[PDB]
Design a protein around this ligand. Sequence first.
Ligand SMILES: *[C@@H](CC(=O)OCC)[C@H](C[C@@H]1CCNC1=O)NC(=O)[C@H](CC(C)C)NC(=O)[C@@H](NC(=O)OCc1ccccc1)[C@@H](C)OC(C)(C)C
Ligand SMILES: *[C@@H](CC(=O)OCC)[C@H](C[C@@H]1CCNC1=O)NC(=O)[C@H](CC(C)C)NC(=O)[C@@H](NC(=O)OCc1ccccc1)[C@@H](C)OC(C)(C)C
Lengths: 306, 306
Amino acid sequence: SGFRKMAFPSGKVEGCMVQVTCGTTTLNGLWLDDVVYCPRHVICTSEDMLNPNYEDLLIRKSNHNFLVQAGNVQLRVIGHSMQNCVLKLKVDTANPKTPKYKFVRIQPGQTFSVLACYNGSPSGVYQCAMRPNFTIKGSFLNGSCGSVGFNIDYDCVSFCYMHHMELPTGVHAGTDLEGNFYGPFVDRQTAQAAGTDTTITVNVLAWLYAAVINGDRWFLNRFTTTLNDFNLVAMKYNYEPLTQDHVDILGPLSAQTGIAVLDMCASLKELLQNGMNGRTILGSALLEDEFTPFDVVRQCSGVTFQ
Amino acid sequence: SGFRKMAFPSGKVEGCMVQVTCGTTTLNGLWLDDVVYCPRHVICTSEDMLNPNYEDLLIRKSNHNFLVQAGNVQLRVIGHSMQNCVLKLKVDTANPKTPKYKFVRIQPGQTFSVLACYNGSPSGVYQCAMRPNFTIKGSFLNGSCGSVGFNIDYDCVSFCYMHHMELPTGVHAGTDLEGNFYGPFVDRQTAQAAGTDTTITVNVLAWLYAAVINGDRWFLNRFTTTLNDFNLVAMKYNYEPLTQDHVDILGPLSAQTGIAVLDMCASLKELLQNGMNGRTILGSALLEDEFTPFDVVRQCSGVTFQ
Ligand SMILES: *[C@@H](CC(=O)OCC)[C@H](C[C@@H]1CCNC1=O)NC(=O)[C@H](CC(C)C)NC(=O)[C@@H](NC(=O)OCc1ccccc1)[C@@H](C)OC(C)(C)C
Ligand SMILES: *[C@@H](CC(=O)OCC)[C@H](C[C@@H]1CCNC1=O)NC(=O)[C@H](CC(C)C)NC(=O)[C@@H](NC(=O)OCc1ccccc1)[C@@H](C)OC(C)(C)C
């Protein structure tokens, strides 16, 4: 039993991290087969921060203007190209520890593991969700750009995030591994701001089911609700609407606990209208929304503590 | 910026996990050089759960009664010995991915990363503290025994925990890597219970400093306190006493923020007496006590958001 914010084991990704240097700028790259992926702002200077023209900056570079370092060996760049906001460096050496991998672009509300890296060296791993406003509440300092987010499925690593920037509220923004930003952000230091965020309703519900599976029932009640009436309450507390698709996704958790999805919605409505009254749920004093239904099934026992 | 429960990268430990089988019982082992470490209760039967005599059970075994599996290769046991509550299996093959490592026994209030494993296969990583009552609030199911907890320092892995058992309240108990239990627990299914726990005061204070470093000051106040008067309040809220050693450990965080340790103690006292009043600190609605001062320094920027 127990329930923890659980990252995937990071070893398959640690073997892919390198250091990329252009000019005097250094950040992290992702080395897969004979290509190194990294944020294109590594070709910026201190002056090209406000409105850089990256196509113009890039045509001014040669292959030998880039330095790639894997551990304590240098990799020679033998070709380069820009793809959206990522740079791809073709290197003379295929990464021997390349895992089975995919590039995936995730939907808001999906979670992933982040391997924070500095100077090509992994420093930590934590679990993140893509917020509805397409930011992540990460932990990133200078030098962290090029750190990647990923999920792991049967030894296949699905890379879904590369880190590019921090917003004024302290949340983080970046791209898929093809260099497309999540959300409306761009990789320049012009005024940008995270939109208003909302709570990921389907994940709160999954997490309440986790709490039931682990033996805690105190927040349940005898009431039910309709999908429409729930969403009227959801809107009022800045929760995302719950769709029939979300209802169907919660199916297995409903079945293992015997609690119908809309019965758990009436529990959540009561928690929203009344608070927790000094109580905790799975050790938390607020409603957690960064566990997907898949995260709950992955970590919880398949037999509920009846 | 940001602040997350951050585990160490787990790759160096993933390379050491194997599956150990004796009879029909299977659990996880730690493969370092030519020795596999695993909990001795792998030699138990369904009948030898209440009061097993492990010396008696073990003399009845041969080397060929143990099966060690690393990935999809079998390792042959060429020798065995019991050390406290761990079994050591000498194997014919030295682990080629053995990292630089140490065995360390940690004090209560220290944190570590846990690589949860099932059948020798890593499944997740999360961050734990050794509670003052020598339990950890982990996430462990059947099959998880032999999973290990560790810290990483300059590519040296310090193993500090091996998982053995769950207590009725859902918290977890285990040993150092020499097989000595943390706390008064024993590896048999006789009635045992976690003692009353207390909050790790020095860690709460470190975490308040993290919040200051990341730009949040709302909970500070103009007051100070003496060490003695703080601890009188600490006792009242089931917090551990703060020692002069704890004061000195918080030194660097005090210096980076300009907030004297005893001034932050007067802030904590106010938070304890008044609550948060609907506010959060680093996104949390309760006072977090599973970040050591060292954890804060490791993750936070060295320059405070003034
Ligand atoms: C990765 C590379 C790096 O370290 O470069 C250092 C010079 C960083 C990761 C950041 C740094 C701190 N935490 C992080 O996650 N990314 C960057 O430095 C970004 C480079 C841009 C060219 C994309 N810049 C920022 O992250 C920047 N944000 C930003 O400018 O947003 C646009 C903006 C919003 C409001 C007002 C003006 C501009 C950060 C560094 O600036 C602050 C003030 C928002 C923190
Ligand atoms: C690891 C090996 C395993 O899976 O064996 C399965 C048969 C597990 C890890 C546990 C299982 C669930 N979550 C975990 O972390 N360890 C064990 O099964 C332990 C083997 C003993 C021989 C040490 N047993 C327990 O963990 C057991 N606790 C226990 O008996 O504590 C003593 C006790 C306390 C009060 C009353 C009676 C006995 C668990 C499985 O039992 C419960 C009821 C406390 C959950």
